[PDB]
Amino acid sequence: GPPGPPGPPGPRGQPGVMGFPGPPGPPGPP
Amino acid sequence: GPPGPPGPPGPRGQPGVMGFPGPPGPPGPP
Amino acid sequence: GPPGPPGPPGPRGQPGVMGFPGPPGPPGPP
């Protein structure tokens, strides 16, 4: 017979990887 | 004629963007 | 009939988790 219909859209991709650490904080007080 | 079975889901999407960098750290010590 | 084609490509994944806060800042002045 004729082909079946196409399947549905593929799954959403995985989330991105975790980001870099932030920079060091600001200086302490005198 | 008799159409075939539905196809499978499509390819998985591409990965997401890497996470943003973290915020600045705590203030320093005296 | 034969199975249908695979479906369309999936969408991009979500952005990743933001990175950790940075470490504590440098010592303050004397």
Structural overview:
The structure is a homotrimer of 30-residue chains. By secondary structure, the first copy, chain A, is mostly loops. Chain A has no helices and no strands. The N and C termini of chain A lie far apart (83 Å). At the A-C interface, loops of A face loops of C.
Chain-wise SSE layout:
The structure is a homotrimer of 30-residue chains.
Chain A: no helix or strand
Question: Summarize this, please?
Answer:
The first copy, chain A, is low in regular secondary structure. The first copy, chain A, has no helix or strand.
State the largest interface: A-B, 30 and 30 residues
Terminal-residue CA separation of chain A: 83 Å
Oligomer: homotrimer
Radius of gyration of chain A: 25 Å
Number of discrete helical segments of chain A = 0
Helices and strands of chain A: which structural class? Answer: little secondary structure
Morphology of chain A: rod-shaped
Report the sheet-strand fraction of chain A: under 5%
Q: How many strand units of chain A? A: 0
- Major β-sheet annotation of chain A: none
The share of residues in helices of chain A is under 10%
List its salient traits.
homotrimer, 30 residues, little secondary structure, structural protein, collagen triple helix, Von willebrand factor
